[PDB]
């Protein structure tokens, strides 16, 4: 079945996006059509995965006879699957025998005849709370077009035999011919591996049907369905032959243009008009300039002064293909907290064709560039910061990628005074360096690291989350693994890398509960119980 996602211009676009459609994955909306211009533009539609909004239609007849069912995945306003209103004389939705979710709204239709007598009881399903059908079973057009009553368990409209393999429209999904409650799972449990495994017979979900792979440009989501595009919290990534909607690692890639190229080609800095154009933005394409004109304001460019609280918009930036110039910062902030998440400064286009990181003449105590790890092309100049203390500690040669890069840290707070005022980084910090006064602002640390912050040592013997050390880092092991005082509660990651499990253990993997009711091999559910030794045994 083919699928789809001035008044003259409206009809053309509508007919274009609906002439070949047979199953609509979205909402069928026929609105604003002029007199005597509809001519079999949409007659083959048999399924709408959403709501059917036929509003303000001057045409005498909107053909929708084949329409078998409206899914109701969306609504017009609320619980509104069929929205026929303010139109239209003949609307023969004869095949319409089911509206899973939503109700039909009848309003402002004086010309609509032969539809007030329709049996909406057989179509609308359990959504009568908002059924204002107020504007003999026959949709119209004399005979032939009748309501074909059938209602007044996976077949929605009707049945053509007492078999699930033969029905008009499946209530939930249709693998290839039989009506299934859900699509074959993509993960299959195998008692031999005591865990989940990719299921070959498992098929992705394509709207109201199950497909081994989704054709055209569709992206499989986490729950097995392949929607048209990945969500806001997900990104498109193609591992195997089909791309999948992998979850974004926090704020994922949103490449915007920086200062010098694009809409900010003639802009000088990130002033108030610039701010908000960098919201939830990562991997700036261009340079990032923060000049005094931003906070002072500019009259010639007609830009109000940038209030310092809007500088947190740049907290999303994790890469800058150009350079970072901070010639002005709010004086009430002791560090560049807007660039704490910045990780790479490619420097492709550097200040004066030289500096890619330039913190100049600021009133900040620390740099606050904890996540900064790579400065590829340009060098670094941190000067004029009369209150900058933890600046020379960082081994800049580690971040640099090109051997020719240098660093011009000069005229900041003296190191002698820096250590005299008690402003020396934490002892939990490898000589590699420190970005600030706390272990969070540490390039590297003496023994371990719990994320950005690094403690004295992992919870190998005592601790609340009971970390286990690996590659000089604290990893909180599976919660299932109970704390162990004699040795280390957990050898490694996963529920199969600890000596003692607080909850039951399925084979080698400690689990909250033994696997019960999960789909297993040969399309058979598997259930497991627990013995006195907390081991999960197959039933």
């Amino acid at each position, epitope marked *: 079945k083919k699928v789809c996602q001035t008044f003259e211009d409206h009809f053309l676009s509508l007919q274009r996006m609906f002439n070949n459609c047979e199953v609509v994955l979205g909402n069928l909306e026929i609105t604003y059509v002029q007199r005597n211009y509809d001519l079999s533009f949409l007659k083959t539609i048999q399924e709408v995965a959403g709501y059917v909004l036929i509003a303000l239609n001057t045409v005498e007849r909107i053909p929708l006879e084949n329409l078998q069912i409206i899914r109701g995945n969306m609504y017009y306003e609320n619980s509104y699957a069929l929205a026929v209103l303010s139109n239209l004389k003949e609307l023969p939705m004869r095949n319409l025998q089911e509206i899973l979710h939503g109700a039909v709204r009848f309003s402002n239709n004086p010309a609509l005849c032969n539809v007030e007598s329709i049996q909406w009881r057989d179509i609308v399903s359990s959504d009568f709370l908002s059924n204002m059908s107020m504007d003999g079973s026959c949709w119209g057009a004399g005979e032939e077009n009748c309501q074909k009553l059938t209602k007044i368990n996976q077949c929605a409209a009707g049945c053509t035999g007492p078999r699930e393999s033969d029905c008009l429209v499946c209530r939930k999904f249709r693998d290839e011919a039989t009506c299934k409650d859900t699509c074959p799972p993509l993960m299959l449990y195998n008692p031999t591996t005591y865990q989940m495994d990719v299921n070959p017979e498992g098929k992705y979900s394509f709207g109201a049907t199950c497909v081994k792979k989704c054709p055209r440009n569709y992206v499989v989501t986490d729950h097995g369905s392949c929607v048209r595009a990945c969500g806001a919290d997900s990104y498109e990534m193609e591992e195997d032959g089909v791309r999948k909607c992998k979850k974004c690692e926090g704020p994922c890639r949103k490449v915007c243009n920086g200062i010098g190229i694009g809409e900010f080609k003639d802009s000088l800095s990130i002033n108030a008009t610039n701010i908000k154009h960098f919201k939830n933005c990562t991997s700036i394409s261009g340079d990032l300039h923060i000049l005094p004109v931003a906070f002072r304001g500019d009259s010639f460019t007609h830009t109000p002064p940038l209030d310092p609280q809007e500088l947190d918009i740049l907290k999303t930036v994790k890469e800058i293909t150009g350079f970072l110039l901070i*010639q002005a910062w709010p004086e009430n902030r002791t560090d560049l907290h807007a660039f704490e998440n910045l990780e790479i400064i490619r420097g492709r286009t550097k200040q004066h064709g030289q500096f890619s990181l330039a913190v100049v003449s600021l009133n900040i105590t620390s740099l606050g560039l904890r996540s900064l790890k790579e400065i590829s092309d340009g060098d670094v100049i941190i000067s004029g910061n009369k209150n900058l203390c933890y600046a020379n500690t960082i081994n800049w040669k580690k971040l640099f990628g090109t051997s020719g890069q240098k660093t011009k840290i000069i005229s900041n707070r003296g190191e002698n005074s820096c250590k005299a005022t008690g402003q020396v980084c934490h002892a939990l910090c490898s000589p590699e360096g420190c970005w600030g006064p706390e272990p969070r602002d540490c390039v590297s640390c003496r023994n371990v690291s719990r994320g950005r912050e690094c403690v004295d040592k992992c919870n190998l013997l005592e601790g609340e989350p009971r970390e286990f050390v690996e590659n000089s880092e604290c990893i909180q092991c599976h919660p299932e693994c109970l704390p162990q005082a004699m040795n280390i509660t957990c050898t490694g990651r996963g529920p199969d890398n600890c000596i003692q499990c607080a909850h039951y253990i399925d084979g080698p993997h400690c689990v909250k509960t033994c696997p019960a009711g999960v789909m297993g091999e040969n399309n058979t559910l598997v259930w497991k119980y627990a013995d006195a030794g907390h081991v999960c045994h197959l039933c």
Partner: single-chain antibody
Amino acid sequence: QVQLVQSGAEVKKPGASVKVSCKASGYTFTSYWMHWVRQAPGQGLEWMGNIWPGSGGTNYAEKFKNRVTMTRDTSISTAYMELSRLRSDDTAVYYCARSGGPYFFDYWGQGTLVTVSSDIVMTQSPLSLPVTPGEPASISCRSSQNIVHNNGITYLEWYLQKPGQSPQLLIYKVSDRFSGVPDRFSGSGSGTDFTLKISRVEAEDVGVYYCFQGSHIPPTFGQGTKVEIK
């Protein structure tokens, strides 16, 4: 303190080129626009283009776009204005102003008189209005279009060019008065009509008042009312 110094005392010939400097001191010269404004005799102040010393990105007026070149000297903190193909009407007084944040041309250069010889129209309803010391005066100004900028801030300004000195900002906004000027001046108006109301005319108040707009691409001044004592 901020102090902008121009070369001054320039005399040229028609068809020649003149270049004047602006030694800007007391502040970071690269953090502020360096506007250039001309005051031809018989006419009010006329904007002729600016420059951003931090990057050298200059803007221009349509009457000087193909005729004037402005370049900055970052190391010595001095902006320049080169006017070529001088005509008979090019004789004027050239000021190197300095754009602020809520206002325009906070500080002005003393002025360079280049005497050479062989757009939202802002018009002030009065012209050379005489008053008596003590009696309140009122200078109205009419704009050709609505100068309320899209951002919601109208860049209406009143400049008092006292005899022998450069223009000085009095009302930095439609009504917001500048720092260092008395409460006597009180700008007023909205939309298209703007009037400046002096509550008490004093001896020092004599001078030419120019209603200025900066909300359009070319900033334009008004003809100027020569307020004088009766």
